[PDB]
Design a protein around this nucleic acid. Sequence first.
DNA 1: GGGGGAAGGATTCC
DNA 2: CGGAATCCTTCCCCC
Length: 342
Amino acid sequence: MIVLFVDFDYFYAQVEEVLNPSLKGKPVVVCVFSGRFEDSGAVATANYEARKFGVKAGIPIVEAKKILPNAVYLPMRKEVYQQVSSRIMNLLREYSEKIEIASIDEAYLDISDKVRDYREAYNLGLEIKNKILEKEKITVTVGISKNKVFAKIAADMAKPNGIKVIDDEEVKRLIRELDIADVPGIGNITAEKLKKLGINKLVDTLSIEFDKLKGMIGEAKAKYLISLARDEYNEPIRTRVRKSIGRIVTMKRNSRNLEEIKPYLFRAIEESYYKLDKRIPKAIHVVAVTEDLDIVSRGRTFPHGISKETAYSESVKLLQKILEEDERKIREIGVRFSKFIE
DNA sequence: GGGGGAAGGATTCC
DNA sequence: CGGAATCCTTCCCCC
Ligand SMILES: Nc1nc2c(ncn2[C@H]2C[C@H](O)[C@@H](COP(=O)(O)OP(=O)(O)OP(=O)(O)O)O2)c(=O)[nH]1
Ligand SMILES: [Ca+2]
Ligand SMILES: [Ca+2]
Ligand SMILES: [Ca+2]
């Protein structure tokens, strides 16, 4: 089996450069302004000229400006990037019917019934890269291997504007030499848990009693890692379907006053329904971020679709249920809709 | 005992 | 900052 993974380079920043070439060459930082105060919010992403100095996704906008006060700061226009993304995804579909659109800037293609060796795979990769650059002026990185995981690791190793195949012999070296933290799905929590168990590489997961691994990181995660370690991980590329749509917003100032929170909540409901389109959810959750940055939620699933009117009244109750069962103030409020009636 | 859900939260990654 | 998926634990009803 042959998997080709595509990951767009510094996506949001690069789309902005495509729409405004005068930006190419200088540091470009795409941000998500939270509105709490001047420059409050975070960096969604930045082009490589900016990353050289530490400005990257996730850092506070205020820290970014300290490092690169004269860079170009742009507000995130996610809708524009989404449409550019869709077009690129359609281009990729022209290379395989078996495509898994993982996120707004990445996808997996099962090109097994399209090519036979890694040679023809690599070449197909270059053609895909050329096609995208030519058509959307977007550079991307391609990773090729036997499964989704290593295809993705391959690209990570080739970033940016690269292409990289990880063949069977290297898959074995990685299992032995790859920091397990560098394995997709293994975050800081899980990685520290694995270190304590003496597991630093995929290979190590094979020298521990399963039940011990299971008990420490969970069944799903334990089996996942063991599969990879045994060089047996093999999940098929399949069409992913959105399972929830939501919106959470940061308020002007903290509060526990219902009348002061409701408009933010409703606005979130309004935006969520617009985005819902023709989808009808049977479930609703109201989400609150306390002053101490904790995230608390209360939801409800009914036996039928939720109308906007129902969403409004129910959401009010759930918020009321949150405030009554938590002494903290609310910093951010939102709603999420799921269990669609399709 | 154990199947089948639902609710709330933990993690992870874009 | 903030959108969203998967998986985990506890709680429940029920035969
Ligand atoms: N709001 C927000 N958006 C993010 C964050 N991280 C990534 N994104 C968005 C914007 C990124 O362009 C897009 C793709 O993420 P990657 O993880 O693929 O980063 P990006 O493509 O920007 O750089 P790259 O060349 O892949 O290293 O997802 C984040 O922490 N917050
Ligand atoms: Ca990505
Ligand atoms: Ca990317
Ligand atoms: Ca990691």
